[PDB]
Design a protein around this motif. Sequence first.
Motif, PDB file in Angstrom:
ATOM      1  N   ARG A 288       0.826  -1.201   0.000  1.00  0.00           N
ATOM      2  CA  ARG A 288       0.000   0.000   0.000  1.00  0.00           C
ATOM      3  C   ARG A 288       0.864   1.256   0.000  1.00  0.00           C
ATOM      4  O   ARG A 288       0.555   2.231  -0.693  1.00  0.00           O
ATOM      5  N   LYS A 291       2.336   1.645  -3.483  1.00  0.00           N
ATOM      6  CA  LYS A 291       1.292   2.087  -4.399  1.00  0.00           C
ATOM      7  C   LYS A 291       0.978   3.562  -4.205  1.00  0.00           C
ATOM      8  O   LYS A 291       0.794   4.295  -5.179  1.00  0.00           O
ATOM      9  N   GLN A 292       0.916   4.019  -2.953  1.00  0.00           N
ATOM     10  CA  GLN A 292       0.707   5.440  -2.697  1.00  0.00           C
ATOM     11  C   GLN A 292       1.862   6.273  -3.238  1.00  0.00           C
ATOM     12  O   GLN A 292       1.648   7.347  -3.813  1.00  0.00           O
ATOM     13  N   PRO A 307      -6.417   0.841  -2.889  1.00  0.00           N
ATOM     14  CA  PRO A 307      -5.791  -0.028  -1.888  1.00  0.00           C
ATOM     15  C   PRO A 307      -6.726  -0.294  -0.718  1.00  0.00           C
ATOM     16  O   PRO A 307      -7.552   0.543  -0.350  1.00  0.00           O
ATOM     17  N   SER A 309      -7.606  -0.429   2.965  1.00  0.00           N
ATOM     18  CA  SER A 309      -7.158   0.285   4.150  1.00  0.00           C
ATOM     19  C   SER A 309      -7.465  -0.458   5.441  1.00  0.00           C
ATOM     20  O   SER A 309      -7.273   0.108   6.521  1.00  0.00           O
ATOM     21  N   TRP A 318      -7.907   5.638  -0.779  1.00  0.00           N
ATOM     22  CA  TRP A 318      -6.605   6.007  -1.315  1.00  0.00           C
ATOM     23  C   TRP A 318      -5.767   6.843  -0.360  1.00  0.00           C
ATOM     24  O   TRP A 318      -4.587   7.072  -0.643  1.00  0.00           O
ATOM     25  N   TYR A 328       3.255   1.463   8.755  1.00  0.00           N
ATOM     26  CA  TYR A 328       3.573   0.533   7.686  1.00  0.00           C
ATOM     27  C   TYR A 328       4.750  -0.351   8.080  1.00  0.00           C
ATOM     28  O   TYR A 328       5.549  -0.015   8.955  1.00  0.00           O
TER      29      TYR A 328
END
Lengths: 468, 314, 136
Positions: A288, A291-292, A307, A309, A318, A328
């Motif tokens: 994630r 991707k962000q 994604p 969450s 997003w 993370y």
Amino acid sequence: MNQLTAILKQHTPMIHFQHNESGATLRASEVKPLLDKFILTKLGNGDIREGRLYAKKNNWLIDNEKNYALNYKLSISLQKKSRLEYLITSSTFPLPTERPSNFFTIQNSPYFAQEKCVGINTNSTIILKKSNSDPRKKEAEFKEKNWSQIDKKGLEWQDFTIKIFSLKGDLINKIQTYLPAFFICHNFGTRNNKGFGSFTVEYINNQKNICNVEDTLKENFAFVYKKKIALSRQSTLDFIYIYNQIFSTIKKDYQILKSGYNFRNEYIKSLLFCYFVSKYPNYRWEKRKMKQLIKARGYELKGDHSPISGIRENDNSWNDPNPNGYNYAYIRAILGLAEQYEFQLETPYQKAIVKIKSANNCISRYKSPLLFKIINNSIYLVGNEINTEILNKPFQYSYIEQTKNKNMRTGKSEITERTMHINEIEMNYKNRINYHYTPTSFSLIDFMQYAMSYKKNGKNILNYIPLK
Amino acid sequence: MPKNYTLQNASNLGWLFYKDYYRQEPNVDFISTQGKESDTTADFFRKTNQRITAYQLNSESPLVAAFNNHFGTPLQLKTIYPGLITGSGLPHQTGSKGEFKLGFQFDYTTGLPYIPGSSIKGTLRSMFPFSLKDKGSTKRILPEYRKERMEYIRDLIIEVTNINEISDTEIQALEYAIFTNSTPSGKTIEFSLEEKDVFYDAFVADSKDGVMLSDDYITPHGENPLKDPKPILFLKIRPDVTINFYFKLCTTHLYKEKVCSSKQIEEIKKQNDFSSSDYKMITAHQKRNLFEKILLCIGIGAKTNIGYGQLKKL
Amino acid sequence: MKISKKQIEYAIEALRANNIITNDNQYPKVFKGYISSFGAAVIQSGLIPAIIFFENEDNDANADRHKIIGVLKDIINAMRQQYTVTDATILVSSQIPANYSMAQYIIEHGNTDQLLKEITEAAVAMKLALRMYKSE
């Protein structure tokens, strides 16, 4: 006595890198070290050092001061050389009808390397070619020269011989006691975590061996799970369908565990992500975060969604809440280092490549902690605790853009490398809690129990629980 | 360069493996740290390896025919899939990429891979009880060593000969007569010229439809399971290659736990005290079958504990 | 091949400097095997390949075999320091530089005959010097 002769039965094909030799079989250079470690561990009752002291006593060691090696000789011989060869790929490809009698295919298998043996190139063993029929279906061609020079082959042999010679009779008796358990506990060959190279002992000194496989697995493993496999009264005489179904199921279950299942209109959230979401202060996907990051620079990723969450119905987003961002971490590193993440963005022919590397040259690889054991057409999922060394380790991400262009009409090849986008980096962010670090707290037993208990109107990974 | 190793057109395998392997070609670097893992060095060594592993040996080779003529009838055995490694301790390692790390035993003149007679003799004597020297550093392990080897050798002797029961002292005498050609105390026995056991060299005789040399990989995975393993490349004798073992064996006469020559037994038999129970003899064929069974049990060469050098009866 | 007393003295000093002979006059057992293997490799593979074998320290499984090349270089340098001024088979423009790799030195100076003779003499002298002292 002096000699111990055993006859082995092969349950799943073995991926052998020396398939070119006619007499190629299971190499003793893997079995003997593994057998030594197994015998020492069982001699010390779970402690290899106590077992090594026990083997130093009775003079069962070649190397009293130095190694783990025991004084015996291992020989593995093929009685008859009727080889049954297999082609293993992780993608579903159309099967040709022009093959030698001993060529068989396993598709959608966990073995993902050697995936270039199919496709469109002069070296692929199975050359996919355009057909005069509907273009949605493609035919296939089999080339013997390419098949003769492949790197590895899946091989299945008939009953073959393992000979153990030792001038120490007591060691031979102990080895006879422990050999069936050893062959029930360890898989051999390439990708042995995923069920290849499964062997069992049939005869020992012309005496049949009666070993309860479940009891041995429970004894030598922490958690044990067995999958409710089925046979529709017809595939009993066709081993190819059985093999295909077993390996496809293995791949599906492992994909559900690690990275989820999105291929054909079905979406099962990865159970690792859900487990880390629901536990102690939440760790979310590193994927994630990447991707962000690739979103924040440009080219949009393919997929008309967002994604995940968290765990909830269509919990699609997003962005992050107004307070500090999520904690993370490299969630998927515990089940194996991947060294490369592939992302397909909105337009075809270009793809984002994320190169994963240890921050300092200390971590290079990690075997999947889970082991899949296929015995008598039954799937067993076993595992001890993970290697704690991977927890709280730093990881470095290098983003690279690869835009496969049109063929230059001369080489039809790839030189689409010289691109790399500079995204934002968050080293030491949130006091070394970010997508550069591992969750530093994880028990394989707890996560394995959490999995195959997650359900919706029925439990996903249809395995019951004989765990020790 | 071609196949079918012959005296007419074939490079010396030992020369190619030891001297021409490390030839100073222009624009090849295996002395500096950077050059050792350079791709040019890897290609150079790879081409040399390809030349080495491309030779064949016809069954009707004049070389092996001359060997059969000079050294008598061969003992033909073949190799099992792992292969056969000998002379692995000979230094052939530079730390470069794509090079054969371990050494290999080649004949100097012929160049054919071979097993020196000393290797055969030592491999055969190792299973015999009185191989370890009573020198003080082996005081602890000598008793168990002798006991287990005595039991195994007694089984083999009883199986292969017509002797119903043999004693430990007779086993000692037989071993010393076969290998040392003397009494266990070092005293020389009055033996004739043809009453000596000679262990000639073992030569490759037939690679039927393939080459006789191949390359294998041993990959030691480290103690740390997270760091990448280090592959090792070496040269092996291929599976299904005929090895010819040449011996010159005699008949061993045992009387009253003592080893005697042909003439001494000729005189002893005539004396009016000759006990048939106290007389044991092992013919040359029985001794050869004993050696054959030892080889088929334990094999010969290096890395034997992990399956290399295991022989099968042709 | 007769080795002079001064060559053996040079071998003793080189062994002391390269920390092979300890202060209490004792040397590790495997060093004599290293010397013999170096001689055999020189006969079997050639001077340059043998020096490359014994200069590679990446083995890390045997003992530290790179010291023997340092001892050889020190003996060769000490021998060259006292070459007579005839300049026919001398070739001593200087000593071998300390940080140079000996294999590169042999490659650069194609006088393999003289270097082979000196290396053989130095190896024999070092064998004798090790025979003087005590093993483990």
